[PDB]
Amino acid sequence: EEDASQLIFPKEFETAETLLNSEVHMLLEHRKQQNESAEDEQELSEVFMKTLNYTARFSRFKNRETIASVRSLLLQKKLHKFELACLANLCPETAEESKALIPSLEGRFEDEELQQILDDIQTKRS
Amino acid sequence: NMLTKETPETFYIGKLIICNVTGIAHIGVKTRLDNGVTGFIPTKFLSDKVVKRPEERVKVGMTVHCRIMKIDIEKFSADLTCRTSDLMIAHPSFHNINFKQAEKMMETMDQGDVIIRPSSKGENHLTVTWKVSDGIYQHVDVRATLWINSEEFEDLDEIVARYVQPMASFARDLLNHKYYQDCSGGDRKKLEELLIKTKKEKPTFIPYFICACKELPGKFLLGYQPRGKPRIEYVTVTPEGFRYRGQIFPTVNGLFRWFKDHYQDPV
Amino acid sequence: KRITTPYMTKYERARVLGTRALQIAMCAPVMVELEGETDPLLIAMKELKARKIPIIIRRYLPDGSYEDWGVDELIISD
Amino acid sequence: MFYHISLEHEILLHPRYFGPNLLNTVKQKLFTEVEGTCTGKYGFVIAVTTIDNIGAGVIQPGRGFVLYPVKYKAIVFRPFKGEVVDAVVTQVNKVGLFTEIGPMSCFISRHSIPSEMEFDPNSNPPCYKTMDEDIVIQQDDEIRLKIVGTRVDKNDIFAIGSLMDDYLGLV
Amino acid sequence: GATPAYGAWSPSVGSGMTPGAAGFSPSAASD
C-alpha cells in the first residue's frame, strides 16, 4: 500500500522533514570536517564515504543561500513536502517531463505555472 | 625449492628472519627456520668461538628474531644476526615515572623549570608540576581541576605557557618579597609564635609576613596581629592572578595595594 | 515546591548505601579519600557521612507527581 | 529519500564510566550505536547531527548498569515505492543492470529495459546501445530509475528499479 | 591516589570581632 506516487506514507513518516541533495551533502561535509579534527576519534566508516561520493555527484548548487532561496520560493505553493525534494533534485527541463515522472502533478497545476517554476529552478543551478 | 619450498630468492638481506636455534654442532647454533630451512648460526652471529655457546643472543630451543643477512636455505645456512643492532629559566623537559622516585629529581632545578609527567590515578591523564618554593610543589592533576579540551594533547607547548608560566611568575614575585620567610616549610605551630615574639619589640608598628604551606601547596599564609590575638587568612594563586577575599587582581601589586586599605576594619 | 519530609528515611538510606556499594564494587570512582580500607560498603558509608554520593532520590506521590531530592540536599538520620 | 526526524534510544552505561566525562561518554556511546544501522520501522539511518537532551539515568535495582533514554536529532534514508531518484550505474551484465542508490543497491533486468537497448558482449566494456548507436549507456553514468519495490535483508535495504517510463537516462 | 586535588579546596575565612581604632600605616601607590 505504501506508494509515494499516490501520496501515502505511515503516520510517523508524514511528520518528517524533507532534505535536498545539496543540503545532505553539505551536512555530511561539515560532519566530516568536524570529525577529522579532534584527534583520538573513531574515523568514518564505509557508509559515510559511499554516501559522500554519492551525494557529491548530484550537487546542483554548492551555495547554501541557493538552497535557502529554492526552498523559500517553493514552500509558498500548496504542494506537499514530498513534492519539495524530488522536483528540486531531478531538475527536469520541461513541464511534460516533470508531469510524466511524477504522476501527482497530472492535473494538479497548469502547464505554464509549472514550466515557469522549472525554468526558475534551472536558472538557479550553478 | 621442490622439497623445502623456500629458496634464497624469497629471503633478502636486511629483512629480519626468525632463526629457531634447536642445536649446535661445535660452537654455533644450527637450527631450523620458519620455512623449513636449516638455519645454521655461526660463531659470528653469537660472538662465541672458543667460549660457551651463545645462549643470550640465540634462543636455544625457541625462535630468536635476528636480522637476515644471508640466503642459504638450500645450503642449510642461516646468517641471522643475534645482536639487536644487526636487525636495525623555563626549561620544559619531558618524561616518557612514579611519584616517590620522581621527587629525587626536582630539588636540583631552579625555580621556573617545569616538567611534565604522566598521572597515577586513571587513564589518559597528565600531571604538571612546577617549581614553587624550596620543597613546595603543586601537582596540578589535569583531568587543581584544570578543565581543558582534547586537541591540546597533540601539542603540549602552550598549556604551561598559558596557565603555568604566568602563575609561576606571580608565585616567584612573592619569593623576593621584603618580609619573606620559610620557618621549616611554614608550619602552623612555628608561624604563630613569631607573630607574638615580634610584637613585643614594636607594639606600635604591626609588621606582616608571608609564607607558603607544605602540606597544601598553592595556599600562601598572610597573617597579621590586629591585637593580642593571632589570625590567619589564606590566599590562592590563580593562573590569571590571585584570589583574595574572592576578588581577582590583574597584577601582583594590585593585591598588595588593595590589602593595605582594608585590614583597618574591626572585622 | 517540594512538600515531602526533609529527612532521609531509613529505607532510602539503606538502599542508597547498598547501591553505592554495588557501584563501587563494579570499579566506579569514589567521592572521598580512602584512609586505607577496601570494603565497598564501608566506602559507601564514608561517602554518605561526607555527603558526596552522586545519587538523587525520586519520591513518587500518590497522585502521580514526584520530587527529586539529592543526598547532599536533605538531612541524614544516622 | 533522506529525511531529518527526531528519534529516541536508550543505552546502558557501565559504572566504570562514571566521572567528569559522563555526558561525553554517553554521547560517544550513542554515536557508535545508531550510525549506519537499519530498522524496518524508520529505515536506514545515515548519521546523527545533534542531540536534543540527556534523560535522567534510572539506576536499575541490583545492577550497576544505568539506562539513559536519549533523544537524538539524526537523519534517515527510507526509500518508498514509486519514488524517482538519480543514481549511478555500477556494472552492466546480460542478466541485468546494477546501480547504487547511496546506501542501497538496486537492480534492473533486461525485461524492464525496452527492446531498443541491445547487448554489446563483443566490445570489451559491457554496454547497451541502439540500432543507430546514438544513445549510449555505460557504467559511471548518472542514470535515473523508479523504485517499484522495497526489501530489507535484516537491516540491509535492497530495492528494485525499473526502466519502462519515458525520460529515464542521460539528462 | 596519594596526590589529591589541591587547588580545588575552598579557602574558609575566619570570623571575629576587634573593635580597634584607626592608627595603622597608610597605603602606597600602585605605580
Coordinates of all heavy atoms in Angstrom, one line a residue, chain B residues 79-218, unseen atoms left out:
Chain B
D79 N 72.2 -17.0 8.1 CA 73.0 -15.8 8.6 C 72.1 -14.8 9.3 O 71.9 -13.7 8.9
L80 N 71.7 -15.2 10.5 CA 70.8 -14.4 11.4 C 71.7 -13.8 12.4 O 72.4 -14.4 13.2
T81 N 71.6 -12.4 12.5 CA 72.4 -11.7 13.5 C 71.7 -11.8 14.8 O 70.6 -11.4 15.0
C82 N 72.5 -12.3 15.8 CA 71.9 -12.4 17.2 C 71.8 -11.1 17.9 O 70.8 -10.9 18.7
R83 N 72.7 -10.2 17.6 CA 72.6 -8.9 18.2 C 71.4 -8.1 17.7 O 71.0 -8.2 16.6
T84 N 70.8 -7.3 18.6 CA 69.7 -6.5 18.3 C 70.0 -5.4 17.3 O 69.2 -5.0 16.4
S85 N 71.2 -4.8 17.4 CA 71.6 -3.7 16.5 C 71.7 -4.2 15.0 O 71.6 -3.4 14.1
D86 N 72.0 -5.5 14.8 CA 72.1 -6.1 13.5 C 70.8 -6.0 12.8 O 70.7 -5.7 11.6
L87 N 69.7 -6.2 13.5 CA 68.3 -6.2 12.8 C 68.0 -4.8 12.3 O 67.5 -4.6 11.2
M88 N 68.4 -3.7 13.1 CA 68.1 -2.4 12.7 C 68.9 -2.0 11.4 O 68.3 -1.6 10.4
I89 N 66.3 28.8 33.0 CA 65.0 29.5 33.1 C 64.0 29.0 32.1 O 64.2 29.2 30.9 CB 65.2 31.1 33.0
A90 N 62.9 28.4 32.6 CA 61.8 27.9 31.8 C 62.3 26.8 30.9 O 62.3 27.0 29.7 CB 61.1 29.0 31.1
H91 N 62.8 25.7 31.5 CA 63.3 24.6 30.7 C 62.3 23.4 30.7 O 62.3 22.6 31.6 CB 64.6 24.1 31.3
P92 N 61.3 23.4 29.8 CA 60.4 22.3 29.8 C 60.9 21.0 29.3 O 61.3 20.8 28.2 CB 59.3 22.8 28.8
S93 N 61.1 20.1 30.3 CA 61.6 18.8 30.0 C 60.4 17.8 29.7 O 59.3 18.2 29.5 CB 62.4 18.2 31.1
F94 N 60.7 16.5 29.5 CA 59.7 15.5 29.2 C 60.1 14.2 30.0 O 61.2 14.1 30.5 CB 59.6 15.2 27.7
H95 N 59.1 13.3 30.1 CA 59.2 12.1 30.8 C 58.3 11.0 30.1 O 57.1 11.1 30.2 CB 58.9 12.2 32.2
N96 N 58.9 10.1 29.4 CA 58.2 9.0 28.7 C 57.8 7.9 29.7 O 58.1 6.7 29.4 CB 59.0 8.5 27.5
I97 N 56.8 7.4 35.1 CA 57.5 7.5 36.3 C 56.5 7.6 37.5 O 55.4 8.1 37.4 CB 58.5 8.7 36.4
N98 N 57.0 7.0 38.7 CA 56.1 7.0 39.9 C 56.2 8.4 40.5 O 56.8 9.4 40.0 CB 56.6 5.9 40.8
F99 N 55.6 8.5 41.7 CA 55.6 9.8 42.5 C 56.8 9.8 43.5 O 57.4 10.9 43.7 CB 54.3 10.0 43.2
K100 N 57.0 8.7 44.2 CA 58.1 8.8 45.2 C 59.5 8.9 44.6 O 60.3 9.7 45.1 CB 58.0 7.5 46.1
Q101 N 59.7 8.2 43.5 CA 61.0 8.3 42.9 C 61.2 9.6 42.1 O 62.3 10.1 41.9 CB 61.3 7.2 41.9
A102 N 60.1 10.2 41.6 CA 60.2 11.5 40.9 C 60.7 12.6 41.7 O 61.4 13.5 41.2 CB 58.8 11.8 40.3
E103 N 60.4 12.6 43.0 CA 60.9 13.7 43.9 C 62.4 13.8 44.0 O 62.9 14.9 44.3 CB 60.3 13.5 45.3
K104 N 63.1 12.7 43.7 CA 64.6 12.8 43.7 C 65.2 13.6 42.7 O 66.4 13.9 42.8 CB 65.1 11.3 43.7
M105 N 64.4 14.0 41.7 CA 65.0 14.8 40.6 C 64.2 16.1 40.4 O 63.8 16.5 39.3 CB 65.0 14.1 39.3
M106 N 63.9 16.8 41.5 CA 63.1 18.1 41.5 C 63.8 19.2 42.3 O 63.7 20.4 42.0 CB 61.7 17.8 42.1
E107 N 64.7 18.8 43.2 CA 65.4 19.8 44.1 C 66.6 20.3 43.4 O 67.2 21.3 44.0 CB 65.7 19.1 45.4
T108 N 67.0 19.8 42.3 CA 68.2 20.3 41.6 C 67.9 21.5 40.7 O 68.6 22.5 40.7 CB 68.9 19.2 40.8
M109 N 66.8 21.4 40.0 CA 66.5 22.5 39.1 C 66.0 23.8 39.9 O 65.5 23.6 41.0 CB 65.3 22.1 38.1
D110 N 66.3 24.9 39.3 CA 65.9 26.2 39.9 C 64.4 26.5 39.7 O 63.7 25.7 39.0 CB 66.8 27.3 39.4
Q111 N 63.9 27.6 40.3 CA 62.5 28.0 40.1 C 62.3 28.3 38.6 O 63.0 29.0 38.0 CB 62.2 29.2 41.0
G112 N 61.1 27.9 38.1 CA 60.7 28.2 36.8 C 60.8 27.0 35.8 O 60.2 27.0 34.8
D113 N 61.6 26.0 36.2 CA 61.8 24.8 35.4 C 60.6 23.9 35.5 O 60.4 23.2 36.6 CB 63.1 24.1 35.7
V114 N 59.7 23.8 34.5 CA 58.5 23.0 34.6 C 58.8 21.6 33.9 O 59.6 21.5 33.0 CB 57.4 23.7 33.8
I115 N 58.2 20.6 34.5 CA 58.4 19.2 34.0 C 57.0 18.6 33.9 O 56.2 18.7 34.8 CB 59.3 18.4 34.9
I116 N 56.8 17.8 32.8 CA 55.5 17.2 32.6 C 55.8 15.7 32.7 O 56.7 15.1 32.1 CB 55.0 17.5 31.2
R117 N 54.9 15.0 33.4 CA 55.0 13.6 33.6 C 53.6 13.0 33.6 O 52.6 13.7 33.9 CB 55.7 13.2 34.9
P118 N 53.4 11.7 33.4 CA 52.1 11.1 33.4 C 51.4 11.2 34.8 O 52.1 11.6 35.8 CB 52.3 9.6 33.0
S119 N 50.2 10.7 34.9 CA 49.5 10.7 36.2 C 49.5 9.3 36.7 O 50.0 8.3 36.1 CB 48.0 11.2 36.0
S120 N 48.9 9.1 37.9 CA 48.9 7.9 38.6 C 47.6 7.6 39.3 O 47.5 7.2 40.5 CB 50.1 7.8 39.6
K121 N 46.5 8.0 38.7 CA 45.1 7.9 39.2 C 44.2 7.2 38.2 O 43.4 6.3 38.6 CB 44.6 9.2 39.6
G122 N 44.3 7.5 36.9 CA 43.4 6.9 35.9 C 44.1 6.7 34.6 O 45.3 6.4 34.6
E123 N 43.4 7.0 33.5 CA 43.9 6.8 32.2 C 43.8 8.1 31.4 O 42.8 8.8 31.6 CB 43.2 5.6 31.4
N124 N 44.7 8.3 30.4 CA 44.7 9.5 29.6 C 44.7 10.8 30.4 O 44.1 11.7 30.1 CB 43.5 9.5 28.6
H125 N 45.5 10.7 31.5 CA 45.6 11.9 32.4 C 47.1 12.3 32.5 O 48.0 11.5 32.3 CB 45.1 11.6 33.8
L126 N 47.3 13.6 32.8 CA 48.7 14.1 33.0 C 48.7 15.0 34.2 O 47.7 15.6 34.5 CB 49.2 14.8 31.7
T127 N 49.9 15.1 34.8 CA 50.1 16.0 35.9 C 51.3 16.9 35.6 O 52.4 16.5 35.2 CB 50.4 15.2 37.2
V128 N 51.0 18.2 35.8 CA 52.0 19.3 35.5 C 52.5 19.8 36.9 O 51.8 20.3 37.7 CB 51.5 20.4 34.7
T129 N 53.8 19.6 37.1 CA 54.5 20.0 38.4 C 55.4 21.2 38.0 O 56.3 21.0 37.2 CB 55.2 18.9 39.0
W130 N 55.3 22.3 38.7 CA 56.1 23.5 38.5 C 56.8 23.9 39.8 O 56.1 23.8 40.9 CB 55.3 24.7 37.9
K131 N 58.0 24.3 39.8 CA 58.7 24.7 41.0 C 58.1 25.9 41.6 O 58.0 26.9 41.0 CB 60.2 25.0 40.7
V132 N 57.7 25.8 42.9 CA 57.0 26.8 43.6 C 58.0 27.5 44.6 O 58.3 28.7 44.5 CB 55.8 26.3 44.4
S133 N 58.5 26.6 45.5 CA 59.5 27.1 46.5 C 60.4 26.0 46.9 O 60.4 24.9 46.3 CB 58.8 27.7 47.7
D134 N 61.2 26.2 47.9 CA 62.1 25.1 48.4 C 61.4 24.0 49.1 O 61.1 24.1 50.3 CB 63.2 25.7 49.3
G135 N 61.0 23.0 48.4 CA 60.3 21.8 48.9 C 58.8 21.8 48.6 O 58.2 20.8 48.8
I136 N 58.3 23.0 48.3 CA 56.8 23.1 48.0 C 56.6 22.9 46.5 O 57.3 23.6 45.6 CB 56.3 24.4 48.4
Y137 N 55.8 22.0 46.1 CA 55.5 21.7 44.7 C 54.0 21.4 44.5 O 53.4 20.6 45.2 CB 56.3 20.5 44.2
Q138 N 53.4 22.1 43.5 CA 52.0 22.0 43.2 C 51.8 20.9 42.1 O 52.4 21.1 41.0 CB 51.4 23.3 42.8
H139 N 51.1 19.8 42.4 CA 50.9 18.8 41.4 C 49.5 19.0 40.8 O 48.5 18.4 41.3 CB 51.0 17.4 42.1
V140 N 49.5 19.8 39.8 CA 48.2 20.1 39.1 C 47.7 18.8 38.4 O 48.3 18.4 37.4 CB 48.3 21.2 38.1
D141 N 46.7 18.2 38.9 CA 46.2 16.9 38.4 C 45.1 17.3 37.3 O 43.9 17.4 37.6 CB 45.6 16.0 39.5
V142 N 45.6 17.4 36.1 CA 44.7 17.7 35.0 C 43.9 16.5 34.6 O 44.4 15.4 34.4 CB 45.5 18.3 33.8
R143 N 42.6 16.7 34.5 CA 41.7 15.6 34.1 C 41.5 15.5 32.6 O 41.3 16.5 31.9 CB 40.3 15.7 34.8
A144 N 42.9 21.3 42.0 CA 43.6 21.7 40.7 C 42.9 21.1 39.5 O 43.5 20.6 38.6 CB 45.0 21.4 40.7
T145 N 41.5 21.1 39.5 CA 40.7 20.6 38.4 C 40.8 21.5 37.2 O 39.9 22.4 37.1 CB 39.3 20.3 38.9
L146 N 41.8 21.4 36.4 CA 42.0 22.2 35.2 C 41.3 21.6 34.1 O 41.7 20.6 33.5 CB 43.5 22.4 34.9
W147 N 40.2 22.2 33.7 CA 39.4 21.7 32.6 C 39.9 22.2 31.2 O 40.1 23.4 31.0 CB 37.9 22.1 32.7
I148 N 40.2 21.2 30.3 CA 40.8 21.5 29.0 C 40.1 20.6 28.0 O 39.4 19.7 28.3 CB 42.3 21.4 29.0
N149 N 40.4 20.8 26.7 CA 39.9 20.0 25.6 C 40.9 18.9 25.3 O 41.9 18.7 26.0 CB 39.7 20.9 24.4
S150 N 40.6 18.1 24.2 CA 41.4 17.0 23.8 C 42.4 17.3 22.8 O 43.4 16.6 22.6 CB 40.5 15.9 23.4
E151 N 42.2 18.4 22.0 CA 43.1 18.8 20.9 C 44.4 19.2 21.5 O 45.5 19.1 20.8 CB 42.5 19.9 20.1
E152 N 44.5 19.7 22.7 CA 45.7 20.1 23.4 C 46.7 18.9 23.5 O 47.9 19.1 23.7 CB 45.5 20.7 24.7
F153 N 46.2 17.7 23.5 CA 47.1 16.5 23.7 C 48.2 16.4 22.7 O 49.3 16.0 23.0 CB 46.2 15.2 23.8
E154 N 47.9 16.8 21.4 CA 48.8 16.8 20.4 C 50.0 17.7 20.6 O 51.2 17.3 20.5 CB 48.2 17.1 19.0
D155 N 49.7 19.0 21.0 CA 50.8 20.0 21.2 C 50.6 20.4 22.7 O 49.6 21.0 23.1 CB 50.6 21.2 20.3
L156 N 51.7 20.1 23.5 CA 51.7 20.5 24.9 C 52.6 21.7 25.2 O 53.1 21.8 26.3 CB 52.1 19.3 25.7
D157 N 52.9 22.5 24.2 CA 53.8 23.6 24.3 C 53.1 24.9 24.7 O 53.7 26.0 24.8 CB 54.6 23.9 23.0
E158 N 51.8 24.9 24.9 CA 51.0 26.1 25.3 C 50.2 26.0 26.6 O 49.9 27.0 27.2 CB 50.0 26.5 24.2
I159 N 50.0 24.8 27.1 CA 49.3 24.7 28.4 C 50.1 25.2 29.5 O 49.6 25.9 30.4 CB 48.9 23.2 28.7
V160 N 51.4 25.0 29.5 CA 52.3 25.6 30.5 C 52.5 27.1 30.2 O 52.7 27.9 31.2 CB 53.6 24.8 30.6
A161 N 52.5 27.5 29.0 CA 52.7 28.9 28.6 C 51.4 29.7 28.8 O 51.5 30.9 28.6 CB 53.3 29.0 27.2
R162 N 50.3 29.1 29.0 CA 49.0 29.7 29.2 C 48.5 29.6 30.6 O 47.6 30.4 31.0 CB 48.0 29.1 28.3
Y163 N 48.9 28.7 31.4 CA 48.5 28.5 32.8 C 49.6 28.3 33.8 O 49.3 28.5 35.0 CB 47.5 27.4 32.9
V164 N 50.8 28.0 33.5 CA 51.9 27.7 34.4 C 52.9 28.9 34.5 O 53.2 29.3 35.5 CB 52.6 26.4 34.1
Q165 N 53.3 29.4 33.3 CA 54.2 30.5 33.2 C 53.8 31.7 33.9 O 54.5 32.3 34.8 CB 54.6 30.8 31.8
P166 N 52.6 32.3 33.7 CA 52.1 33.5 34.4 C 52.0 33.2 35.9 O 52.3 34.0 36.8 CB 50.8 33.8 33.7
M167 N 51.4 32.0 36.2 CA 51.3 31.6 37.6 C 52.6 31.5 38.3 O 52.8 31.9 39.4 CB 50.5 30.3 37.7
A168 N 53.6 30.9 37.6 CA 54.9 30.7 38.1 C 55.6 32.1 38.4 O 56.2 32.3 39.4 CB 55.8 29.9 37.2
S169 N 55.4 33.0 37.4 CA 56.0 34.3 37.6 C 55.3 35.0 38.8 O 56.0 35.7 39.6 CB 55.8 35.2 36.4
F170 N 54.0 34.9 39.0 CA 53.3 35.5 40.1 C 53.8 34.9 41.4 O 54.0 35.6 42.4 CB 51.8 35.4 39.9
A171 N 53.9 33.6 41.5 CA 54.4 33.0 42.7 C 55.8 33.4 43.0 O 56.2 33.7 44.2 CB 54.4 31.4 42.5
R172 N 56.7 33.5 42.0 CA 58.1 33.9 42.2 C 58.1 35.4 42.7 O 59.0 35.8 43.4 CB 58.9 33.8 41.0
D173 N 57.2 36.2 42.3 CA 57.1 37.6 42.7 C 57.0 37.7 44.2 O 57.6 38.6 44.8 CB 55.9 38.3 42.0
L174 N 56.4 36.8 44.9 CA 56.3 36.8 46.3 C 57.5 36.3 47.0 O 57.8 36.6 48.1 CB 55.1 35.9 46.8
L175 N 58.3 35.4 46.3 CA 59.6 34.9 46.8 C 60.5 36.0 47.2 O 61.2 36.0 48.2 CB 60.2 33.9 45.9
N176 N 60.6 37.0 46.3 CA 61.5 38.2 46.5 C 60.9 39.3 47.4 O 61.4 40.4 47.4 CB 61.9 38.8 45.2
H177 N 59.8 39.0 48.1 CA 59.2 39.9 49.0 C 60.1 40.3 50.1 O 60.9 39.5 50.6 CB 57.9 39.4 49.5
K178 N 60.0 41.6 50.5 CA 60.9 42.1 51.6 C 60.7 41.3 52.9 O 61.7 40.8 53.5 CB 60.6 43.6 51.9
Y179 N 59.5 41.1 53.3 CA 59.2 40.3 54.5 C 58.8 38.9 54.2 O 57.6 38.6 54.1 CB 58.2 41.0 55.4
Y180 N 59.8 38.1 53.9 CA 59.5 36.7 53.4 C 60.3 35.8 54.4 O 61.4 36.1 54.8 CB 60.0 36.5 52.0
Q181 N 59.7 34.6 54.6 CA 60.3 33.6 55.5 C 59.8 32.2 55.1 O 58.9 32.1 54.3 CB 60.0 33.9 57.0
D182 N 60.5 31.2 55.7 CA 60.1 29.8 55.4 C 59.7 29.1 56.7 O 58.6 28.5 56.7 CB 61.2 29.1 54.8
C183 N 60.5 29.2 57.8 CA 60.2 28.5 59.0 C 59.9 27.0 58.9 O 58.8 26.5 59.3 CB 59.0 29.3 59.7
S184 N 60.8 26.3 58.2 CA 60.7 24.9 58.0 C 59.4 24.5 57.3 O 58.5 23.8 57.8 CB 60.8 24.1 59.3
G185 N 59.2 25.1 56.1 CA 58.1 24.8 55.3 C 56.8 25.5 55.7 O 55.7 25.2 55.2
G186 N 56.9 26.4 56.6 CA 55.7 27.2 57.1 C 54.7 26.3 57.8 O 53.6 26.2 57.4
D187 N 55.1 25.8 59.0 CA 54.2 25.0 59.8 C 53.3 25.9 60.7 O 53.7 27.0 61.1 CB 55.0 24.1 60.7
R188 N 52.1 25.5 60.9 CA 51.2 26.3 61.7 C 51.6 26.5 63.1 O 51.2 27.4 63.8 CB 49.8 25.6 61.7
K189 N 52.4 25.6 63.7 CA 52.9 25.7 65.1 C 54.0 26.7 65.2 O 54.2 27.2 66.3 CB 53.2 24.3 65.6
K190 N 54.8 26.9 64.2 CA 56.0 27.7 64.2 C 55.7 29.1 63.7 O 56.5 30.1 64.1 CB 57.2 27.1 63.4
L191 N 54.7 29.3 62.9 CA 54.4 30.6 62.3 C 53.6 31.5 63.3 O 53.5 32.7 63.1 CB 53.7 30.5 61.0
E192 N 53.0 30.9 64.4 CA 52.2 31.6 65.3 C 53.1 32.3 66.4 O 52.8 33.4 66.8 CB 51.2 30.7 66.0
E193 N 54.1 31.6 66.9 CA 54.9 32.1 67.9 C 55.7 33.3 67.5 O 56.0 34.2 68.3 CB 55.9 31.0 68.4
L194 N 56.1 33.4 66.2 CA 56.8 34.5 65.7 C 56.0 35.8 65.7 O 56.5 36.9 66.0 CB 57.3 34.3 64.2
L195 N 54.7 35.7 65.5 CA 53.8 36.9 65.5 C 53.8 37.5 66.9 O 53.8 38.7 67.0 CB 52.4 36.6 65.0
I196 N 53.8 36.7 67.9 CA 53.7 37.2 69.3 C 55.1 37.6 69.8 O 55.3 38.4 70.7 CB 53.1 36.2 70.2
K197 N 56.2 37.0 69.2 CA 57.5 37.3 69.6 C 58.0 38.6 69.0 O 59.0 39.2 69.5 CB 58.5 36.2 69.3
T198 N 57.4 39.0 67.8 CA 57.9 40.2 67.1 C 57.1 41.4 67.5 O 57.6 42.5 67.3 CB 57.7 40.0 65.6
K199 N 55.9 41.3 68.1 CA 55.1 42.4 68.5 C 55.7 43.1 69.8 O 55.6 44.3 69.9 CB 53.7 42.0 68.8
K200 N 56.4 42.4 70.7 CA 56.9 43.0 71.9 C 58.0 44.0 71.6 O 58.1 45.0 72.3 CB 57.4 41.9 72.8
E201 N 58.8 43.8 70.5 CA 59.8 44.7 70.2 C 59.3 46.0 69.5 O 60.0 47.0 69.5 CB 60.8 44.0 69.2
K202 N 58.1 46.0 69.1 CA 57.5 47.2 68.5 C 56.0 47.1 68.6 O 55.2 46.8 67.6 CB 57.9 47.3 67.0
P203 N 55.4 47.4 69.8 CA 54.0 47.3 70.0 C 53.2 48.2 69.1 O 52.1 47.9 68.7 CB 53.8 47.7 71.5
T204 N 53.8 49.4 68.7 CA 53.1 50.4 67.9 C 53.0 49.9 66.5 O 51.9 49.7 65.9 CB 53.8 51.7 67.9
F205 N 54.1 49.6 65.8 CA 54.1 49.2 64.4 C 53.8 47.7 64.4 O 54.3 46.9 65.1 CB 55.5 49.4 63.8
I206 N 52.9 47.3 63.5 CA 52.4 46.0 63.3 C 52.9 45.4 62.0 O 52.1 45.5 61.0 CB 50.9 45.8 63.5
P207 N 54.1 44.8 61.9 CA 54.5 44.3 60.6 C 53.8 43.1 60.2 O 52.9 42.6 60.9 CB 56.0 44.0 60.9
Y208 N 54.1 42.6 59.0 CA 53.4 41.4 58.4 C 54.5 40.5 57.7 O 55.6 40.9 57.4 CB 52.3 41.8 57.4
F209 N 54.1 39.3 57.5 CA 54.9 38.3 56.8 C 54.1 37.5 55.8 O 52.9 37.6 55.8 CB 55.6 37.4 57.8
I210 N 54.8 36.7 55.0 CA 54.2 35.9 54.0 C 54.9 34.6 53.9 O 56.2 34.6 53.9 CB 54.1 36.6 52.6
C211 N 54.2 33.4 53.8 CA 54.8 32.1 53.7 C 53.8 31.2 53.1 O 52.6 31.4 53.2 CB 55.3 31.6 55.1
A212 N 54.4 30.1 52.5 CA 53.6 29.1 51.8 C 53.6 27.8 52.6 O 54.7 27.4 53.0 CB 54.0 28.9 50.4
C213 N 52.5 27.1 52.7 CA 52.5 25.9 53.4 C 53.1 24.8 52.6 O 53.4 24.9 51.4 CB 51.0 25.5 53.8
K214 N 53.3 23.6 53.3 CA 53.9 22.5 52.6 C 53.0 21.3 52.4 O 53.1 20.6 51.4 CB 55.1 21.9 53.5
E215 N 52.0 21.1 53.3 CA 51.0 20.0 53.1 C 50.0 20.4 52.1 O 49.4 19.4 51.4 CB 50.4 19.7 54.4
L216 N 49.7 21.6 51.8 CA 48.7 22.1 50.9 C 49.4 23.1 50.0 O 49.2 24.3 50.2 CB 47.5 22.6 51.5
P217 N 50.2 22.7 49.0 CA 50.8 23.7 48.1 C 49.8 24.6 47.4 O 48.7 24.1 47.0 CB 51.6 22.8 47.1
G218 N 50.2 25.8 47.1 CA 49.4 26.7 46.4 C 48.4 27.6 47.3 O 47.5 28.1 46.9

